[PDB]
Amino acid sequence: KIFKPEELRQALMPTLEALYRQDPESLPFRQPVDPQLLGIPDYFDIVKSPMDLSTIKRKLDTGQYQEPWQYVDDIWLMFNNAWLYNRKTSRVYKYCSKLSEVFEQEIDPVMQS
């Protein structure tokens, strides 16, 4: 349909901002994963399409999403990368689970509209 940049931005950005608000859970997600600084050199072998909150924010504000399903895809790619890469015992995996709950709570309403 006719989804305007400002439309999507106004519709979707609260869902994004709602993730950031989650603390500490959003912290491993706010910036692209840095394999070198973090000392986990296999990361880019496991995760072939990285994604994080900050990259998604850019895409919204640069109107790079045509449709809300594209936004929702990146959010799930982001969570899925974390679940894939991190072990189920790890804190960042556990944070991924929690954060995903919050996203689902926020986006189901918005996606009806």
């Binding site: 070198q36 600084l37 973090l38 000392g39």
Partner: protein
Amino acid sequence: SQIQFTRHASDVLLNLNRLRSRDILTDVVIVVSREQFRAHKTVLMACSGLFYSIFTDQLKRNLSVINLDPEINPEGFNILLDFMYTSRLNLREGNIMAVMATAMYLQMEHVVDTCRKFIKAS
């Protein structure tokens, strides 16, 4: 005679950055107005004339906290702190004057000089 490991210096610097990132064995906090920065004193000394002078002074060497001049811009300090630990200097037209001013105060002369080149070729 001796074997030259050409990546050793970078590797040391990287690892120092990692320890910074994880707050391992940082021994000083640099207060720039309201902002705060944890760092390693030796890396600071190694990159900055001012920090060299401060920490060489026996009456300051064992301080855990150093307050910069209140005139000093935090974003500028932060860019330079990151430079100290990476060899990478993020120069933009929006930051250049604050970065250079901060470098001048910190006595980081090849940085100051690079800043002037950026300005003039702008």
